[PDB]
Design a binder for this molecule. Structure first.
Ligand SMILES: O=C(NC1CCOCC1)[C@H](Nc1ccc2c(c1)CNC2)c1cc(Cl)cc2[nH]ncc12
Lengths: 156, 39
């Protein structure tokens, strides 16, 4: 159905009314989202059907219709924008300077912004509008606030 | 069944709301894809 590039809401009709469970990025005919949003299940776009193509629970990512297409990376210095798509609310750009997640396997960027769980999968962008990762997998710190990793996949 | 709905273009907005801090955190990632704070 709808294959236009852009940001999309991932909805369900299983719970009360219509519920937004996450968000995704359509790019080069491929739908990219977080694994915990869909759990690998098939998606619908009007009459069209999107089937999972690649996914990994540890990276918390999943692609539909083709391999992962997003490869831009945070430069480690510049401010970025979270294109937040909250449930029942309009898409909104929020600019912030990322922090760092230090892990035994290396450093990852981190965006310290609080949004409902249904915002998971919203893209993080660089100054050229390129998707450097998805927001929606992270940690809750001391004051009860949320810090998301800048989760990016590997392009083949 | 899950479905998708378009919500907008992917573009950088000049003069967007600037907010949020930049913490340096020690974290661990388990096999289930869950991050946790290491202290
Ligand atoms: O980061 C999250 N989950 C916790 C946060 C700290 O404890 C461990 C994992 C939420 N998403 C999510 C849920 C299920 C799984 C995963 C990610 C990956 N593995 C399965 C989540 C998203 C958003 Cl956008 C906001 C949020 N606030 N609190 C939570 C929250």
């Amino acid at each position: 159905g709808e294959t236009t590039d852009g940001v999309y809401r991932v909805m369900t009709r299983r719970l009360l009314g219509s519920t937004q469970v996450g968000v995704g990025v359509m790019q080069e005919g491929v739908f990219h989202t977080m694994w915990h949003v869909t759990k690998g299940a098939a998606l619908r776009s009007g009459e069209g059907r999107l089937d999972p193509y690649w996914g990994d629970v540890k990276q918390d990512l999943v692609s539909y219709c083709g391999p992962w297409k997003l490869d831009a990376a945070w430069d480690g210095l510049s401010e970025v924008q979270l294109l937040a798509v909250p449930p029942g609310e309009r898409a909104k750009n929020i600019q912030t300077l990322p922090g760092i997640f230090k892990t035994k396997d290396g450093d990852i960027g981190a965006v310290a912004l609080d949004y409902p769980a249904g915002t998971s999968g919203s893209p993080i962008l660089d100054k050229c509008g390129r998707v450097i990762g998805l927001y929606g997998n992270g940690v809750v710190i001391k004051n009860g606030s949320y810090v998301s990793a800048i989760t990016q996949g590997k392009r083949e | 069944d899950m479905y998708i709905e378009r919500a907008g273009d992917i573009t950088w907005e000049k003069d967007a709301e600037v907010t949020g801090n930049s913490p340096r955190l020690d974290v661990a990632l388990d096999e289930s894809g869950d991050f946790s704070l290491v202290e």
